[PDB]
Amino acid sequence: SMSRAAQLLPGTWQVTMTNEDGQTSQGQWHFQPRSPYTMDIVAQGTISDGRPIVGYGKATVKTPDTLDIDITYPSLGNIKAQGQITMDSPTQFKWDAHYKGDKDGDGYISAAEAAAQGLTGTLQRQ
Ligand SMILES: CC1=N/C(=C\c2cc(F)c(O)c(F)c2)C(=O)N1C
Ligand SMILES: [Ca+2]
Numbered sequence: 120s121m122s123r124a125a126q127l128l129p130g131t132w133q134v135t136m137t138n139e140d141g142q143t144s145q146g147q148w149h150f151q152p153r154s155p156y157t158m159d160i161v162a163q164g165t166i167s168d169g170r171p172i173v174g175y176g177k178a179t180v181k182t183p184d185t186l187d188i189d190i191t192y193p194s195l196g197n198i199k200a201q202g203q204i205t206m207d208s209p210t211q212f213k214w215d216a217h218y219k220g221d222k223d224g225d226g227y228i229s230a231a232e233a234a235a236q237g238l239t240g241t242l243q244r245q
Contacts, residue, residue: 122155124206125180127244134164136214136240142167148242156180162190170195178204188216196224200238214240 128150136144146164153159162174176190184206192198202216217235221228 121180121183123183124186124212125152125156125158125178127206127209128152128158128178128186131245132212132242133245134162134214134240134242136238138166139237144172144240146172147245150178158186160188160190162192174200176200188214196221198222198232202238204242210244212242214238214242 129152130150132148132150134144134146134148138144144164144166146162149161151159156179158178160176160178162172162176164172166172171194172192173194174190174192176188178186178188181187181203185203188200188202188204190200192200198218198220200216200218202214204212204214207213216238218238219235220232222232223229
């Protein structure tokens with residue numbers, strides 16, 4: 120069924136990521152249900168350069184195993200990440216996405232900031 124993956128989400132997940140620059144991150148995603156198919160997300164964590172992660176976004180069912188994710192990170196100059204989480208097990212999801220925007224928060228979009236940058240990761244049920 121289309122909501123089988125969504126039904127697992129409500130609550131807190133441990134999240135680890137890797138970006139295209141070679142950095143890693145650790146933190147949490149918290150899902151708040153808004154319907155059988157949609158969730159609100161808040162995000163916290165730290166990048167391997169020490170920078171804090173603060174974000175909020177939304178999840179929407181796409182297939183029985185996947186959900187579309189859009190997250191904005193105020194702690195990272197309001198960069199926008201868009202991607203999909205794919206169910207791997209009842210307690211694990213895989214993350215594949217890309218982001219762009221004023222990551223360094225200086226108010227100007229540099230070349231590194233102008234195009235999409237890859238983001239991969241894993242979510243583990245806590
Ligand atoms: C661990 C974690 N990293 C997140 C985002 C994130 C991680 C990164 F390594 C980035 O370069 C970046 F632009 C965003 C997130 O929301 N969580 C929970
Ligand atoms: Ca910038």
